[PDB]
Amino acid sequence: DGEKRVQVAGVIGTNAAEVVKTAVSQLFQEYPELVRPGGCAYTTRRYNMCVRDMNYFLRMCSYAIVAGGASVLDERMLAGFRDTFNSLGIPLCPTARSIQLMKKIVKEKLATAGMTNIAFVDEPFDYIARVISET
Numbered sequence: 001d002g003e004k005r006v007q008v009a010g011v012i013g014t015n016a017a018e019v020v021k022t023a024v025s026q027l028f029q030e031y032p033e034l035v036r037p038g039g040c041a042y043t044t045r046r047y048n049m050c051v052r053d054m055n056y057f058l059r060m061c062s063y064a065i066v067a068g069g070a071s072v073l074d075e076r077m078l079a080g081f082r083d084t085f086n087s088l089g090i091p092l093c094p095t096a097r098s099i100q101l102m103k104k105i106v107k108e109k110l111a112t113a114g115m116t117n118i119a120f121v122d123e124p125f126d127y128i129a130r131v132i133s134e135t
């Protein structure tokens, strides 16, 4: 387990910038509102913070897999972002999708690298997505 968990975070840490850029690209296809006025990536300032946020979530997921699970992540802190995002008009369902997309992009690269029987990787993506979109 521990060796594969390290091997996974190596792949994610190596392919960190591309996994985000690939995930945000497909996110804007399915949610084109984000690149329109009102959306959370209309301006360059907002877009930069949008890829920054996605990088934070993938970052948390890599550590969570290396650490042994999503228990390490603080549920109050993630629930703090839920309230902030609602207040600042960042919609929660697209935020959830972006994480679940980043799960999918990571799952491809691990399979293309060679790894199979990779269910444990899902946990912190599905956990952060669950606590973000709870209401």
Ligand SMILES: *C=C(*)C1=C(C)C(=O)N/C1=C\C1=NC(=C\c2[nH]c(/C=C3\NC(=O)C(C=C)=C3C)c(C)c2CCC(=O)O)/C(CCC(=O)O)=C1C
Binding pocket: 034, 039, 040, 041, 045, 046, 047, 049, 050, 051, 053, 054, 056, 057, 081, 084, 088, 090, 094, 095, 098
């Ligand atoms: C839409 C694109 C983005 C989705 C995918 C998303 O997750 N957020 C959207 C982008 C924006 N985020 C903004 C402000 C903001 N985000 C966070 C989230 C974190 N900050 C952290 O340190 C961590 C974990 C280490 C997370 C998860 C916070 C706290 C904030 C507010 C403070 C700040 O960092 O600026 C904004 C700006 C909204 C506005 O204009 O007020 C966008 C856009």
